[PDB]
C-alpha cells in the first residue's frame, strides 16, 4: 500500500514528463508514447535496481531512445536531451553526469549503451514485431 502509493506517484510524474517530451518530439508517430511508457513502467517495476543512485528522467530518456531505435524512427539522443532541458525542473547534469559502473560517471549515452540497453535489450526487441503490443495502462491523472 505505502509502496503502491509511492509507485503510483512515481508513475504519474514519469508519465507526465514522458508525455511532454513525446508531444514535442514524436508529434507524428503518436503510437510510440504508449509503447515507450510500457518499457519505462516495466523498468521501474521490474528492473528497479537501474534506479539505484540514479534519476527517473534518465530511465525516461533511455526508454524513449530505445523504442524509437527498434521502430526505426529517426530520433537522436542529442535531440531528446535538448528537448529535456526545457522541462521546468530540468538540469543538464542529469544527462551529462550519470552513474555508470561502481563510481564511474559518464554521459547518459554511456549509461544507455553500457547499462540500460544491455539490461533491457530483450524487452526492447519485443517491439520489433508487428503483432499488437500488450501495453501498460496509462497512469491516472
Amino acid at each position: 500500500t505505502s509502496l503502491s502509493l509511492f509507485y503510483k506517484k512515481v508513475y504519474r510524474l514519469a508519465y507526465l514528463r514522458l508525455n511532454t517530451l513525446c508531444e514535442r518530439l514524436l508529434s507524428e508517430h503518436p503510437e510510440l508514447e504508449h509503447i515507450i511508457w510500457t518499457l519505462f513502467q516495466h523498468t521501474l517495476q521490474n528492473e528497479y535496481e537501474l534506479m539505484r543512485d540514479r534519476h527517473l528522467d534518465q530511465i525516461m530518456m533511455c526508454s524513449m531512445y530505445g523504442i524509437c531505435k527498434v521502430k526505426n524512427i529517426d530520433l537522436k539522443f542529442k535531440i531528446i536531451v535538448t528537448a529535456y532541458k526545457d522541462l521546468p525542473h530540468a538540469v543538464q547534469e542529469t544527462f551529462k553526469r550519470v552513474l555508470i559502473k561502481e563510481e564511474e560517471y559518464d554521459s547518459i549515452i554511456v549509461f544507455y549503451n553500457s547499462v540500460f540497453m544491455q539490461r533491457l535489450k530483450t524487452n526492447i526487441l519485443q517491439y520489433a514485431s508487428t503483432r499488437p503490443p500488450t501495453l501498460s495502462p496509462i497512469p491516472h491523472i
Binding site: 531505435k69 527498434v70 554521459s107 547518459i108 549515452i109
Partner: peptide, 9 residues
C-alpha cells in the same frame, strides 16, 4: 541495432 552512435555535444 539498439546502439547509440552519438557523443554528447
Amino acid at each position: 541495432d539498439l546502439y547509440c552512435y552519438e557523443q554528447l555535444n
